[PDB]
Design a protein around this ligand. Structure first.
Ligand SMILES: *[C@@H]1O[C@H](CO)[C@@H](O[C@@H]2O[C@H](CO)[C@@H](O[C@@H]3O[C@H](CO[C@H]4O[C@H](CO[C@H]5O[C@H](CO)[C@@H](O)[C@H](O)[C@@H]5O)[C@@H](O)[C@H](O)[C@@H]4O)[C@@H](O)[C@H](O[C@H]4O[C@H](CO)[C@@H](O)[C@H](O)[C@@H]4O)[C@@H]3O)[C@H](O)[C@H]2NC(C)=O)[C@H](O)[C@H]1NC(C)=O
Length: 339
């Protein structure tokens, strides 16, 4: 590589002069970002050894990348260990200590992240925002320690205001969404394994600067020991759009709350029981969605406002083991969808 750094400030000072960078065993000073924004176009950046971070109660990000034609890779043996248990307090980003976001994959164009091995994020892991064609391959996010040490709001991939995001072969163990797409166009999640969290989610959609989800493929993935399997949420009273979404080849195991949940009634982060019509869900395909829900959970819950869900196609959906909801509303007729 042009440049190998074991020091965070040296790396930040020198980055734009390096065509290839190795970040080797960096201890990132407490309360600071490993700031890899503004890279020279075409730069490759490789993590080696164990990256760690000083402790401070602050908002992060711990790491930040931006640029065009950037490749962000992990070397054999590397890890990025945030030692999140230092912050974890069962309250996540909703109270207790101020806890830093981990990785800002922001303003990355025609770029790729491959093979990053991430452990113990304080709260959310990857924030993907203002990205234009970004591959995210074979990323491992292991927040399993958080199950018994107070992990909360440890989402793996949060996506907004982005296009052409392609997440492939992710392996996630956490306590919140495996995926949350709040907005974006041409977003893929495929070949993934999601354990311990809240499933593969669209939304909540609405009430943000960007409320459009269009052309999404979430496929060939396993969801295990999670609250939800397939999830789409839209915000009560909001305007937006969820269209051209396909979930296919999704296996579910021991889902606690909902195998499939689609509801248009989110207000301040909680369902109201009353759906609203300003964020229509159209062109929704579910194909080959199979598996088990806990007896105390619910197989399928569809809570559409009148006229607000249409052009759905569901086939090979076999979700069993939980209760059958008596509360579903306005399911697209003839779609094959059923609670
Ligand atoms: C919706 O989102 C998706 C996901 O982001 C968008 O799909 C992505 O689009 C981008 C372009 O914007 C693609 O990047 C390009 O990929 C081209 C093809 O790459 C692959 O093929 C290469 C060649 O394959 C063969 O050769 C190799 C040996 O060379 C063999 O080993 C192999 O078996 C094949 O026989 C592979 O080498 C490579 O690893 C990929 O598998 C590239 O050719 C292209 O590179 C061009 O530009 C580069 C400058 O950045 C330059 O270096 C190159 O020379 C070349 O000019 C570029 O990387 C993504 O691959 C693609 N991702 C996926 C998953 O599809 C999609 O476009 C978007 N939809 C819309 C409507 O926008």
């Amino acid at each position: 590589a042009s440049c190998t750094f074991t020091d965070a400030a040296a790396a930040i000072k020198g980055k734009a002069s390096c065509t290839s960078i190795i970040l080797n065993g960096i201890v990132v000073p407490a309360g600071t970002t490993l700031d890899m924004t503004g890279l020279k176009s075409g730069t490759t950046v490789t993590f080696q050894g164990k990256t760690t971070f000083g402790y401070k109660e602050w908002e992060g990000p711990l790491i930040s990348f931006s640029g065009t034609n950037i490749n962000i890779n992990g070397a054999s043996g590397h890890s990025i260990d945030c030692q999140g248990s230092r912050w974890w307090d069962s309250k996540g980003s909703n109270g207790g200590k101020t806890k830093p976001k981990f990785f800002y994959a922001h303003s990355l164009k025609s770029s790729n992240i491959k093979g990053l091995n991430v452990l113990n994020t304080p709260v959310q892991a990857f924030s993907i925002n203002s990205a234009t064609t970004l591959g995210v391959y074979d990323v491992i996010i292991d927040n399993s320690a958080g199950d018994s040490a107070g992990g909360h709001n440890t989402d793996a991939f949060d996506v907004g205001s982005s296009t052409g995001v392609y997440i492939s072969g992710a392996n996630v163990k956490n306590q919140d969404d495996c995926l949350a797409i709040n907005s974006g166009t041409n977003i893929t999640f495929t070949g993934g394994t999601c354990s311990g969290g809240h499933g593969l989610s669209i939304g909540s959609v609405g009430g943000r600067s960007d409320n459009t989800v269009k052309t999404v493929t979430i496929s060939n993935s396993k969801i295990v020991n999670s609250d939800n399997g397939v999830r789409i949420k839209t915000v009560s009273g909001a305007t937006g759009s969820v269209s051209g979404v396909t979930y296919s080849g999704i296996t579910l195991s021991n889902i606690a709350k909902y195998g499939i949940v689609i509801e248009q009634d989110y207000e301040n982060g909680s369902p109201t029981g009353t759906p609203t019509n300003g964020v229509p869900i159209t062109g929704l395909t579910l194909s080959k969605i199979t598996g088990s829900v806990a007896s105390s959970g619910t197989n399928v819950y569809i809570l559409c406002a009148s006229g607000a869900c249409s052009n759905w196609k569901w086939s090979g959906v076999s979700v069993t083991g939980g209760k059958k909801s008596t509360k579903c509303s306005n399911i697209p007729s003839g779609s094959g969808a059923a609670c």
